[model samples]
Target: GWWNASDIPAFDKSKITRQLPLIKVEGNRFVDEQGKTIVFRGVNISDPDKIDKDKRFSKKHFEVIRSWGANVVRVPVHPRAWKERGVKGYLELLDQVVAWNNELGIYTILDWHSIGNLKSEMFQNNSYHTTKGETFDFWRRVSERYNGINSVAFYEIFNEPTVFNGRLGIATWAEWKAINEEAITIIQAHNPKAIALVAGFNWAYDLKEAAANPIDRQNIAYVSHPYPQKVGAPYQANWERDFGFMADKYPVFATEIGYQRATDKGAHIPVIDDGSYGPRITDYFNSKGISWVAWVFDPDWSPQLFTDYQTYTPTMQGEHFRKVMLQDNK
Candidate 1:
């Protein structure tokens, strides 16, 4: 296929996840079975089907991720996209990826990647999978699938939940919380021991509201998708005051942190050599043991980590990420 297994003899699939430990949030930290505090870095797999289509996911891909010294990889699942592969197919795909991480010692975050109304970013009025039943049902089924997979560490209840001009039936923290709690209730119903990650409104930027009142559950962490706007002085100051306030009580996971070049219009997030933006945010997270998974792993994305999927070479973001996560200087 891509390359013979023997050809890649240097890569061993035995170093990690041999006897994987359950990761639990214990007193504001993610701890293993032995209760050891763990602060591991990782990258997010934007869409599993996309990785499938582009042929970037394989044993070699996991090898490179492990080589980078990251202990976790968040896999974002698109409901409709996964349905294209069918329930059985998607679950089977997750089975394969979970097995890969199990062998390589990396953790998995099965993210319900609901960025917004997919069919139309214009938002929906509770149509499609945008309501209570559709939202909770997905988690109920998927959570059952991963009930026994310990390596499937955390269940990111939902991705960036935001306002939609009064559309989608959720615009404020109160409305968003109702949806999140319902989903969390579903996940915990079956897998009571599993960790469910909840986020705030404003595309996860308004965790100040979430901090004012954390989720009513145990072993759960708060996820934040902080962009460049969430970093630096005044912005970070507010974030720290609101979101960081909960850090001492709950594990704050920066599951998605990204920055594009100055080219992507308003998305120009310079994480290259700038000492002000990405580096500062990453440093803050590292210093506080706030676990984060960068925006993407694919080459096609705007602030992508890979130079090209085929080569798996690090781009400006990836190079800087390696240095940051791997702690090369140390």
Candidate 2:
């Protein structure tokens, strides 16, 4: 019951117990400093900037994550909050998270969470940080801040970038490609060892063009957000066309994967609905050696891992995720 916090799992930081020095993506696999292949499974939560704006981050939260078998955690940073509250406040929490994960021996991915409403086309009444100078500026400061910090693993250039090609007539991928390269340049300038995470158009779903026209950078890993539409709906074919092709060529991380629950309090928008193929989606990725992080862990969020934060009780999906994290299937 959510009313009872005692049922919340015992927290431990180093369940894997094996020490490793940061993670770097090479070819289609993740390797440590010693160059051994590793696969990471984990959860994501709201940005440290939201929900107390970084005040909620603590040992308990991280411990809850590590207690499960997950080896990595992705934290989405909202550009709005970071801009409003100032990057300094946001960085304070990020630095803390990096330190905690470093001590716990887990990997962390910092996401520049945006929906790709690029602000560059303000003339066309389009404004998102993606095309605005803010995107690069944020990376420059953040990359410099985490310079030489191995535990601060992947820096996702942007999250869920969409195309304005249809109506607004935008060359999103080309522009994104350029933006990605510039951001990587900033990141690599200070942290040359950083593995920059890049995604394609269509809310991080379409990577077809990304494969055709790749981002020119030293350490690059592609990201995909696969929310299957229907059970029998050419999921595999679409995946191959969009991202699977790159699975053999590059490291692809489906950073966000989940279904839409219309009944969930606030989950009203159209999300990837895998229906019966949901489990298969998970299996497919694992069988293919792709890295993934589920949509969220917030007790209140749909596809939620914990239905209630007070008790830290699991939701239906949460229970299953726990099983996966705990390796019940294995």
Candidate 3:
């Protein structure tokens, strides 16, 4: 059946009774609820990679996220999570989050993390199967499904679209724009109020190209993921400089970013810096009033999470994040 926007459940405003007015974009400044420029400081939860609903870790994990003073949560969703668990599971998970946000008055970004068919490096380079027409179709379905949820501040079109290589052919910015625009059209048809979060080429690191070729739609925000691995390749300086440039053009969000310290020896690993990098980046974003979600909320992924509790703990990173990123530090 064709999905109807009106049919989608409305967000229980009472649930999210005291939300900090959204970060309104006025030219380059992001004005907060108090009419002051603000930045969103939060974390990303890797629920997509760990889709087990029965896992005790999932529930406990979210409670921790809320406790951490996170105003927003970026929960990555795999296609399998939707295909296998069905929308009911997704909705249940979302409901739980909404309930939390209602209690806490925060925001959430529903991310579509496709990783099966678009697993090749070619596809990743091309922008994570975003060029495929079917991908947008899937997004439309998801959008229609969550049409009325105002608590959902943004619809992340795809997570790391430029992760793997494409077998069909190399994906291009033009192709990505076409697909994203289509997805936006479908999403707007249902929930025109929701903001569309668009990523750039090469795992959203190609903001230079993104700025050069902008999205043709209005009410769209650009998202970028800054990984330490890309530090030298793209360089942190380049990111700061480029972000400043793009922020001039449109509202920008660092949807994903965090330091990862390896617990065990791996092929490629970086020395633990006690989340020094995370704070530096957070400080920059905070000063600019740019909203951000740290790459992870869970401390399971090496550097993003602390490798050793004694050496690096969730409490430690959370403290740094709260001090540096969050608007309210309690």
Candidate 4:
């Protein structure tokens, strides 16, 4: 029998007695319920346009993810998906996704996959946030909408903020702090208990810049996308070296990572090394107790799940990485 979203079970928040540890402002870490440092092991879903058409909304996907021991899932939402399709499409998709996760008892991260027009000029020419005023309005709407969902663990203000012609890149430390401070204020006003995730410059690869210009918000987490092209050197060596440096300054999350493997010859492949790199990278995350979501679960680019390594059978590479990254291995 096949699983459907409607057939998935529901989550009971009261049953979730275990909570991840907290990183205090005084530079100390403490676990809340389980007394263990929290490490969110998960995978990101690609653009909604792709997922919506593939009938990938089935409950079997969620069931497989849960079976693999994944407690978190990252979903990216494009601005066009929201603006053109309207809030109904965006919220409904999110609602179904949340319902699915809630049934599976998995934490979720809602990401705004604002790209092309919304991205910085260096990355793309389309302008979504030509003015700071527009940016604030966007966050306000987002905060107001999802303020009450406890299942949502984090609110990613924007996807790869550095990519928008350096709006985040050009701002001074004080300016950056001011902008985030305002955004945080707006978000907390609506959902006081929610944790906000912020990214650094250069598509979140430049942690050194973040360290130089520290954000003044509390109960907030920092993120980095350690892709091979951004690392500036060999993949594994750069990950070890750079991640070590950033961890000392802030509780970091590798929001995105990928391998270059593809099952077919003509498929698009990621440039971040090769397919064999997946396990090695997962080992690094496990060793440091760092949380992460792989580059993507779809077969769009790089190591695509369906077209690359999985071949004929359901590969569940996304789910496999989730389990190995989250659970303690003997």
The candidate maximizing TM-score is 2
Error of 1 at 234 (Å): 3.8
Candidate 1, residues 205-253, lDDT tens digits: the string is 5677877666676778898777775455575566687576677878888
Query: Which tens-of-lDDT digit does each residue in 182-237 have in candidate 4?
Result: 87898888777667777766656556666776778776777777754555446566
Clashes of each: 2, 4, 22, 9
Tens-digit lDDT track of model 2 for 25-111: 777787877888777778887667654644566777788778866778898887666666565556666776777776776788899
Which residue pairs in model 2 clash with each other? 117-128, 118-128, 119-127, 119-128
lDDT of each: 0.70, 0.70, 0.61, 0.59
Q: Give candidate 4 regions above 4 Å deviation.
A: 1-30, 33-35, 115-135, 163-174, 232-237, 262-270, 308-323, 326-330
Cα RMSD to the true fold for all candidates: 7.1, 8.0, 4.9, 6.8
lDDT of 1 at 73: 92
Q: Alpha carbon lDDT of residue 56, candidate 4? A: 70
Q: Where is model 3 more than 4 Å wrong at Cα?
A: 1-24, 32-35, 48-54, 57-60, 115-134, 163-168, 233-236, 262-275, 299-319, 326-330
Provide the lDDT at 130 for model 2.
Answer: 36
Question: Per lDDT, what order, best first?
Answer: 2, 1, 3, 4
State every prediction's TM-score relative to the real structure.
0.84, 0.85, 0.77, 0.76
All candidates in order of TM-score, best leading: 2, 1, 3, 4
lDDT (tens digit, per residue) of candidate 3 on 1-330: 112213445444555455445544566555555677655677777664353442533445555566667778787775555545555445556666656654566677888765322322344222233334445656665576555655566788877656335543466777778777878888889876677888876667557776878888877888877665555533446767655467766778888776544543231332234456666767666555567787555445433443332343554445677556434532
